[PDB]
Every structure is written in C-alpha cells, then in structure tokens.
Amino acid sequence: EDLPQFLQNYLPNAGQTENTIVPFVTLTYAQSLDARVSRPETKTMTHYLRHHHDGILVNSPRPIIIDTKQKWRFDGSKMQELFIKRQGKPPIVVVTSEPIIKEQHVDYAICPINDTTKLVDWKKLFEILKEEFNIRSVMVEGGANVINQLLLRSDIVNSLIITIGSTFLGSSGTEVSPPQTVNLKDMSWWKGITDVVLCARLAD
Template identity: 40%
Template sequence: MSLVPLPESLVPFLDPYLPKPINEKRPFVTLTYAQSLDSRIAAQSGVQTKLSHLETKTMTHYLRSKHDAILVGINTVLADDPKLNCRYDGGSGGQIKIRPIVLDPLHKWQYSESNLRKICDAGQGLAPYILVDESVKDVEQPVLLSQGGKVVKLPLLKNRANNWHMIFDKLYEMDIESVMVEGGACVINDLLGGCGPVDSVIVTVAPVFLGENGVQVSPKTGVSLTDVSWWTGIQDSVLCARL
C-alpha cells in the first residue's frame, strides 16, 4: 500500500525535534507512538490496533527516514508482526533503509517466520539486530545472519534499571547515531519514566477512546513535558515535546 503525500506543514513542525548531534556518546533518542484519547495504544493486550490516520502514518515513515534505527519490544513484534521498514522516499524513488532493533531478552521471536524476513527477502528493508539476554542459548538464526542481521547478547536480566543506558551505549558502539523508539507500552513507560535518555517525544493522538481493557501508556511517576508544540491534521493531532 502506497503512502499518501506528507502534509507540507509537518516538515517545519517536526524539524526542531528531529535528530541533531548531541554532546554524549550515545544515540539521539526519539520516543514516538500513537495513542487514543484515554492514553491507550491498543484495544487489548496482544491485539493489533490501528489508530493513525493515513497522513500521520506517512509522518511515521517520514520520521523513520530521519533515523538510523527503529526499536521495538518483543510484545509489539509478537502482537503486530510489523515490517519495520521505511516507505517514505521524499519523491526520489529511492529506498531509505532503517535498521530494526528488537528487544527480546528471552529470545521468543522466530525471525525466519516473520513479515520482516519477507521484506528483507524482497530487498525492501534491513534485517534486525535482536537484543537477547546473555544467558540465552541456541540463538543461531542462519537466515538472519545471511541477511546481515545480528543476535546481540547483553546482561538484560541482571539489572533492568540500567538496561536502557546499556542498550543505547551498545547501539552507539555499533555505529547507530539515532534511534526511533516506537513501543510497546513497557518500553514507552520505561523511557517516559526516566529509565533511559529521551531527546524528543512525538505522540499522535487519535480521536477515539479504547476503553478500560486497552493497553495503557502511564509511567509510574508524573512526567512534565517542555518545548511543547501541537499540529492538527484531518483526524489526528500530533504532540512534539521534550522531557
């Protein structure tokens, strides 16, 4: 499915929040996701829920074109089987490729059976780097390795409070200078709650209530945003801010 044109007004609106050089040896981190009016990102746990309007879906791919990598947690991968590629080319007709990063401490995901594997087979994306705990055995995935992906072992289960700093430090060592974090709820709540660095927050708000059974974004402590800007489209509103 092709993307609708990117609304022209989104380009200057998003620009101040896009990756810039930072004076730290870590990637620039953008936290972005779509939510309902009652702060839910899915109708139920494990159920894929489409919230974004077509124009904000194009915005998501535009944002991906500005980052080196896109990071998601294992629950998002198992629920949505996402393609994790970039379909925005700015009218150039060229393929912009972004590196998927999948946080999968217990190694639950079978990449060889995924939509992402099919995308890579077709030359439309990059194979992922899969982050697993160092205790996990039998992590060889020949298809993944043949496509240029990697299984990266880290001590993820020992000191979870420090995981995000360790993860971003490792990605920086692997020449990834900007990361777009898209979910799911545990990942978002961790980063909103201060467990790791976040340089920009970009939230799409859809005009719908998903109800009390929905998967909620709600960090453990209160969070104040600064440098706040709003954009309103045909259906959705977009919040850009910093923590």
C-alpha cells in the same frame, strides 16, 4: 506538507550526540484520547520519522527487537520477507546471553541487566547499539511497557512525539501511562483534521 517543518526541530541533530557514546533517542507513539495504544492521517509522519533514524526499536532503518527470553524468530517473519525483497533491513536482536543457535543475517546485542531494576539497562543498551552497531539514532515506537519505562528517562530520551486520535479505545485497551508524573518542556502542537500531534522534550 507543512508537517515536516513542524517536526524539524525535534529530529536527530547530528552535532548533539556526536562525540558521545549515546545515540539520539526519540519516543513516539499513537494513542486514543483515553491514552491507549491498542484494543491515517498518521502514516506520512511515521515513515518520515523512520527515514530520519538509523534504528527503530519495537536509508531504511534497522529494526531492533527486545527478546531477552529468546522466543522470537526471523525465519518466517514478515520482516524477513521485506528483507528478501530488498526493501527492508535485517534486525538487531537484544538478548541477555549469547543464543545457542543464531540466525543468518541477524545481529545479537548482548546487553547486561541493571542490578537495581529487574529489567535491562537502557542506557547501556543504547550505547551498545551505537558503539557496536553504528546506530546513531533510534526511534522507539512501542511496547507500552517500553514507553512507560522510558518516559521516566529524561537523561536518555531526546524527543517525544505523540499522535492523539479523536477516539476512545475503551478501558481494557493497553495504556501508556508512566508510574509517576512526568513533566515536559519545549512542547509544540500540530493539528490535523482528526488528529493532533505533540512534539516535546522531557524535563530534567
């Protein structure tokens, strides 16, 4: 439809991160009016987006998983079923240390922890993804926890793509809301019938 023409200027631009060690990073999610991501007609856009990124963090993109605590498992996942049926890629799993036992077909990005933050060094992580795993572009889709952090990272994020659904999920839903104010620039809105989509960049 006209929706790709709408997205076009916000997709990875190759000459932009070429000759840099950082990948293109887009932040994308779907929220209700009350800014909640949990507790149509979106699916076309999301799939289109996915097929314009090398990696997707949560041809066909490679799944990337944050799992520093090392509880997650590829064996017996839906993602593994898709992979076996030749319609999906195996994951890259972000860890802090080399796992004692590893899984067949799984890659492990060993990424250091930022000394100031309690959490993981995002810029480092994305560099590892690009330099070690040839991920030239990544679409991060979720962890409201993850969204909330990266909203603060204008030195990292390149595109912001938000779908807003014409509904209220309720106050106990998990919210996306950065801990400080965040300004946008180069915004562009699209309107559907029940949805609206925002494309933008992060100022600074």
